[PDB]
Amino acid sequence: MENFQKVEKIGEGTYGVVYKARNKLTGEVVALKKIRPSTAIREISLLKELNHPNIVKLLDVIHTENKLYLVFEFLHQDLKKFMDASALTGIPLPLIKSYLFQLLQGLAFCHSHRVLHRDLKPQNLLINTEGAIKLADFGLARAFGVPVRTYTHEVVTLWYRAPEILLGCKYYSTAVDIWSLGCIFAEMVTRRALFPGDSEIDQLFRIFRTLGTPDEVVWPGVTSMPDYKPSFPKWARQDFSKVVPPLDEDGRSLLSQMLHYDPNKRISAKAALAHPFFQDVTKPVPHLRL
């Protein structure tokens, strides 16, 4: 775009190239996303009004010479990079708590306007020096469905996918985002991915090896689902003290409610914020190197 001066290529998205740019009129540093129907245009235009402190601001939507440009607020780092830098020491519990609290606040706002992300991962989670965390790419999965591969042919991660999506459920609810956040929560505490599957079936069998193979008792309607097979191996449920040590009981209780099989019984973002785990939340600042 003409009104912007590119500074450098800052990454590869699901849909297109992400650049760090500067506006020639305002002088403001921005994140410029470039992609490549009329309904997809309407969907993204509505997101310019989904404003909250824990959601990455969609500053503008530009459709020119038959290509999509998305102007976002700039944040210096993502959670994936922070987790790798903090891998040998771990992220301190007060910081893990604050990030989850703030993420749950972002989700609660969006789910109240009937908007879901559908593809949460540490990569699309952005952090700053003031101790804040924000959700990036929110609502883009409704506009264009999640592909198998990115524009660069890179494999789209299955690690954070909810079990209802993997079983062939056509009508996804907001409970899908609560699952992904729960998986990210466990990863922050553990310093290792919860379910790092490398195929849809590997992902599904990894969930089952830990949480137990679901049945009509725990999940009413699971056996009637599109991709469910009665030939599925029957694994028993693992404890939880083995799943996320050395995390306390309040943390184990909250994670358990976020990882429930039945989407209807899985805790909402609003209810999670009322959990006694957040009794002593604070807002600490991390030691960011930029």
Q: Which residues are annotated as a binding site?
A: 10-18, 33, 73-75, 78, 121-124, 137
Q: Work out whether 106 is an interface residue with ligand A07 (CB under 6 A).
A: no
Name the closest residue to ligand A07 (Cβ).
31
- 70: β partners: 33, 61
Nearer to ligand A07, 55 or 204 (CB): 55
Nearer to ligand A07, 56 or 207 (CB): 56
DSSP state of 121: -
- 35: β partners: 16, 68
Q: End-to-end alpha-carbon separation of the chain, Å?
A: 27
The window from 11-19, 91-99, 236-244, 262-270 that contacts ligand A07 (CB under 6 A) reads 11-19
Within 10 A of 48 (CB to CB), how many other CB atoms are there? Answer: 13
Nearer to ligand A07, 141 or 165 (CB): 141
Three-class DSSP category at 274: coil
CB of 30 to ligand A07, least distance (A): 8
Alpha helices by DSSP H, 222-275? 249-258, 269-272
The window from 119-127, 191-199, 235-243, 272-280 that contacts ligand A07 (CB under 6 A) reads 119-127
Establish whether 119 is a catalytic residue: yes
Within 10 A of 86 (CB to CB), how many other CB atoms are there? Answer: 16
Q: Please tell me which residue in 60, 84, 119, 280 is annotated as part of the active site.
A: 119
CB of 256 to ligand A07, least distance (A): 29
Report residue 193 CA to chain centroid gap. 14
The window from 73-81, 206-214, 230-238, 266-274 that contacts ligand A07 (CB under 6 A) reads 73-81
Closest CA to 248 of 286, 207, 279, 284: 279
What mask of x and - would describe binding to ligand A07 in positions 21 to 60, judged by CB under 6 A? ----------x-x----------------------x----
Give the C-alpha separation, 206 to 210, whole Å: 7
CB of 6 to ligand A07, least distance (A): 14
Three-class DSSP category at 205: helix
Nearer to ligand A07, 7 or 273 (CB): 7
